[PDB]
Amino acid sequence: SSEPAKLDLSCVHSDNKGSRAPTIGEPVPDVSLEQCAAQCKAVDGCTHFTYNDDSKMCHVKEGKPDLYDLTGGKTASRSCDRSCFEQHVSYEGAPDVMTAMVTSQSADCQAACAADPSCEIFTYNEHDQKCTFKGRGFSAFKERGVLGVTSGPKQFCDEGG
């Protein structure tokens, strides 16, 4: 009958997390992470989604993540692609453009920054499971060779960057 339920994706918080944001249109129940990921690619205006692993429902959402405790919640960016990311590099001295986030994927930081009109780069602490978002002038406050971080000076690597 096709349409499989919650199949492990590249980017998914998995540790029961959702994100506060407008559910664009209507959710898709009994779908997969991959299928719901395809859903956010089907709807324009979507930066990230929330797969409910309990209700297997797909909540496509609008720009910038907003993680919170969601039982069975699986939230991630519309793109788990990291082809446009820069590994082992941290921008911190740079003036932030967004509030840092705690996620287990550099993807969420991507959807965060790529959704913001004033955001240029981001960095994901692969250690602390954290995001950081910094604006223009980041090059002066750039650290190369930083263990446990992944940066991205572009949009969704698959959808823009």
mmCIF file of C-alpha atoms in Angstrom:
data_model
loop_
_atom_site.group_PDB
_atom_site.id
_atom_site.type_symbol
_atom_site.label_atom_id
_atom_site.label_comp_id
_atom_site.label_asym_id
_atom_site.label_seq_id
_atom_site.Cartn_x
_atom_site.Cartn_y
_atom_site.Cartn_z
ATOM 1 C CA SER A 1 0.000 0.000 0.000
ATOM 2 C CA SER A 2 3.142 2.171 0.079
ATOM 3 C CA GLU A 3 3.528 5.081 2.523
ATOM 4 C CA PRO A 4 5.747 3.541 5.270
ATOM 5 C CA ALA A 5 5.757 4.673 8.898
ATOM 6 C CA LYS A 6 8.647 6.523 10.580
ATOM 7 C CA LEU A 7 11.781 5.374 8.748
ATOM 8 C CA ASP A 8 15.070 6.595 10.216
ATOM 9 C CA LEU A 9 16.210 9.762 8.459
ATOM 10 C CA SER A 10 19.572 11.513 8.283
ATOM 11 C CA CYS A 11 18.379 14.370 10.492
ATOM 12 C CA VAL A 12 15.968 13.603 13.300
ATOM 13 C CA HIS A 13 16.224 14.702 16.919
ATOM 14 C CA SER A 14 14.637 11.381 17.957
ATOM 15 C CA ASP A 15 15.059 12.229 21.674
ATOM 16 C CA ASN A 16 11.398 13.309 21.794
ATOM 17 C CA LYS A 17 11.520 16.837 20.407
ATOM 18 C CA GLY A 18 9.237 19.178 18.574
ATOM 19 C CA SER A 19 9.470 22.774 17.439
ATOM 20 C CA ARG A 20 7.134 25.671 18.035
ATOM 21 C CA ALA A 21 6.069 27.010 14.660
ATOM 22 C CA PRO A 22 2.987 27.173 12.396
ATOM 23 C CA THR A 23 1.952 23.824 11.016
ATOM 24 C CA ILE A 24 1.736 24.706 7.359
ATOM 25 C CA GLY A 25 -1.426 23.353 5.796
ATOM 26 C CA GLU A 26 -2.418 20.031 7.319
ATOM 27 C CA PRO A 27 -0.287 17.223 8.842
ATOM 28 C CA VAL A 28 0.296 13.823 7.265
ATOM 29 C CA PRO A 29 -0.455 10.819 9.511
ATOM 30 C CA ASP A 30 1.094 7.361 9.317
ATOM 31 C CA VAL A 31 4.034 8.682 7.322
ATOM 32 C CA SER A 32 7.757 8.237 7.547
ATOM 33 C CA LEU A 33 10.527 10.670 8.425
ATOM 34 C CA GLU A 34 11.586 10.408 4.821
ATOM 35 C CA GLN A 35 8.016 10.803 3.592
ATOM 36 C CA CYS A 36 7.403 13.746 5.907
ATOM 37 C CA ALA A 37 10.740 15.161 4.779
ATOM 38 C CA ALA A 38 9.333 14.879 1.276
ATOM 39 C CA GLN A 39 6.217 16.617 2.587
ATOM 40 C CA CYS A 40 8.176 19.699 3.606
ATOM 41 C CA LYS A 41 9.672 19.619 0.138
ATOM 42 C CA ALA A 42 6.145 19.469 -1.278
ATOM 43 C CA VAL A 43 4.950 22.508 0.665
ATOM 44 C CA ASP A 44 6.523 25.904 0.022
ATOM 45 C CA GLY A 45 7.246 28.006 3.040
ATOM 46 C CA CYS A 46 8.581 25.112 5.075
ATOM 47 C CA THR A 47 11.971 25.103 6.739
ATOM 48 C CA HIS A 48 11.528 22.211 9.113
ATOM 49 C CA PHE A 49 9.037 19.613 10.179
ATOM 50 C CA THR A 50 7.972 17.578 13.146
ATOM 51 C CA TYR A 51 7.385 13.875 12.812
ATOM 52 C CA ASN A 52 5.414 12.482 15.617
ATOM 53 C CA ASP A 53 6.795 8.987 16.121
ATOM 54 C CA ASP A 54 3.840 8.192 18.374
ATOM 55 C CA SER A 55 1.069 9.482 16.085
ATOM 56 C CA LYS A 56 3.257 9.031 13.021
ATOM 57 C CA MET A 57 1.940 12.404 11.936
ATOM 58 C CA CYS A 58 3.901 14.936 9.897
ATOM 59 C CA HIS A 59 3.735 18.531 11.064
ATOM 60 C CA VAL A 60 5.375 20.716 8.402
ATOM 61 C CA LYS A 61 6.375 24.021 9.945
ATOM 62 C CA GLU A 62 7.630 27.474 9.069
ATOM 63 C CA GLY A 63 11.039 29.110 9.460
ATOM 64 C CA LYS A 64 13.369 28.724 12.458
ATOM 65 C CA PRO A 65 13.161 25.694 14.798
ATOM 66 C CA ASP A 66 11.981 26.040 18.360
ATOM 67 C CA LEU A 67 12.746 22.805 20.130
ATOM 68 C CA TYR A 68 10.809 21.666 23.172
ATOM 69 C CA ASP A 69 9.915 18.427 24.971
ATOM 70 C CA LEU A 70 7.685 16.435 22.619
ATOM 71 C CA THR A 71 7.172 12.782 23.582
ATOM 72 C CA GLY A 72 7.897 10.685 20.506
ATOM 73 C CA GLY A 73 8.567 13.944 18.790
ATOM 74 C CA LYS A 74 11.006 13.912 15.949
ATOM 75 C CA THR A 75 11.902 17.353 14.642
ATOM 76 C CA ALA A 76 14.562 18.295 12.106
ATOM 77 C CA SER A 77 15.313 20.609 9.196
ATOM 78 C CA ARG A 78 13.759 20.048 5.764
ATOM 79 C CA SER A 79 17.268 19.228 4.654
ATOM 80 C CA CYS A 80 19.683 16.938 6.460
ATOM 81 C CA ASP A 81 22.288 17.637 3.799
ATOM 82 C CA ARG A 82 25.601 18.856 5.147
ATOM 83 C CA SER A 83 27.322 19.327 1.804
ATOM 84 C CA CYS A 84 27.352 23.094 2.309
ATOM 85 C CA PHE A 85 28.571 22.854 5.908
ATOM 86 C CA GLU A 86 32.100 23.431 7.142
ATOM 87 C CA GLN A 87 33.233 20.887 9.716
ATOM 88 C CA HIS A 88 35.561 21.699 12.607
ATOM 89 C CA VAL A 89 35.122 25.463 12.618
ATOM 90 C CA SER A 90 33.482 27.813 15.089
ATOM 91 C CA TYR A 91 32.265 31.379 14.834
ATOM 92 C CA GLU A 92 31.470 32.814 18.269
ATOM 93 C CA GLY A 93 33.006 36.245 18.652
ATOM 94 C CA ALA A 94 30.708 37.282 15.829
ATOM 95 C CA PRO A 95 27.521 39.132 16.865
ATOM 96 C CA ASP A 96 24.719 36.602 17.059
ATOM 97 C CA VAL A 97 21.716 36.943 14.820
ATOM 98 C CA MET A 98 19.664 34.249 16.532
ATOM 99 C CA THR A 99 19.280 32.467 19.844
ATOM 100 C CA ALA A 100 21.372 29.302 20.117
ATOM 101 C CA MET A 101 19.557 25.998 20.019
ATOM 102 C CA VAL A 102 20.140 22.548 21.437
ATOM 103 C CA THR A 103 19.618 19.885 18.784
ATOM 104 C CA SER A 104 21.296 16.615 17.827
ATOM 105 C CA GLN A 105 21.688 17.658 14.194
ATOM 106 C CA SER A 106 23.473 20.473 12.409
ATOM 107 C CA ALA A 107 20.421 20.408 10.151
ATOM 108 C CA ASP A 108 18.217 22.283 12.619
ATOM 109 C CA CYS A 109 20.764 25.093 12.827
ATOM 110 C CA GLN A 110 20.633 25.173 9.024
ATOM 111 C CA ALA A 111 16.857 25.626 8.971
ATOM 112 C CA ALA A 112 17.270 28.222 11.692
ATOM 113 C CA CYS A 113 19.770 30.383 9.872
ATOM 114 C CA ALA A 114 18.500 29.739 6.348
ATOM 115 C CA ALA A 115 15.067 30.907 7.448
ATOM 116 C CA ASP A 116 16.292 34.156 8.937
ATOM 117 C CA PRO A 117 16.765 37.222 6.695
ATOM 118 C CA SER A 118 19.562 38.559 8.877
ATOM 119 C CA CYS A 119 21.446 35.296 9.343
ATOM 120 C CA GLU A 120 24.605 34.428 7.417
ATOM 121 C CA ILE A 121 26.258 31.538 9.201
ATOM 122 C CA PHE A 122 25.699 28.993 11.937
ATOM 123 C CA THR A 123 27.654 26.421 13.922
ATOM 124 C CA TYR A 124 26.578 23.148 15.458
ATOM 125 C CA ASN A 125 28.383 21.825 18.499
ATOM 126 C CA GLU A 126 28.468 18.111 17.785
ATOM 127 C CA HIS A 127 29.539 17.774 21.404
ATOM 128 C CA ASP A 128 27.019 19.872 23.312
ATOM 129 C CA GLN A 129 24.378 19.225 20.679
ATOM 130 C CA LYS A 130 24.081 22.963 20.175
ATOM 131 C CA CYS A 131 23.567 25.518 17.427
ATOM 132 C CA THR A 132 24.917 29.057 17.168
ATOM 133 C CA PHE A 133 23.952 31.785 14.700
ATOM 134 C CA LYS A 134 26.166 34.705 13.740
ATOM 135 C CA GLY A 135 25.958 37.511 11.222
ATOM 136 C CA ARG A 136 28.246 39.455 8.903
ATOM 137 C CA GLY A 137 31.759 39.906 10.232
ATOM 138 C CA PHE A 138 31.983 36.254 11.196
ATOM 139 C CA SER A 139 35.189 35.828 9.184
ATOM 140 C CA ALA A 140 37.161 37.824 11.757
ATOM 141 C CA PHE A 141 35.758 35.700 14.552
ATOM 142 C CA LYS A 142 36.266 32.436 12.719
ATOM 143 C CA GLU A 143 38.080 29.497 14.282
ATOM 144 C CA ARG A 144 39.360 26.736 12.007
ATOM 145 C CA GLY A 145 40.108 23.314 13.435
ATOM 146 C CA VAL A 146 37.502 23.291 16.179
ATOM 147 C CA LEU A 147 36.661 19.833 17.465
ATOM 148 C CA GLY A 148 33.037 19.036 18.006
ATOM 149 C CA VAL A 149 31.520 21.720 15.809
ATOM 150 C CA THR A 150 30.117 22.080 12.324
ATOM 151 C CA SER A 151 29.425 25.427 10.696
ATOM 152 C CA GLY A 152 27.389 26.507 7.712
ATOM 153 C CA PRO A 153 27.735 29.837 5.881
ATOM 154 C CA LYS A 154 24.826 29.081 3.569
ATOM 155 C CA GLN A 155 21.188 28.027 3.326
ATOM 156 C CA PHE A 156 19.691 24.533 3.134
ATOM 157 C CA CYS A 157 22.500 22.631 1.357
ATOM 158 C CA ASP A 158 19.835 20.845 -0.701
ATOM 159 C CA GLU A 159 17.240 23.612 -0.954
ATOM 160 C CA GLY A 160 19.334 26.759 -1.351
ATOM 161 C CA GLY A 161 22.936 26.655 -0.223
#
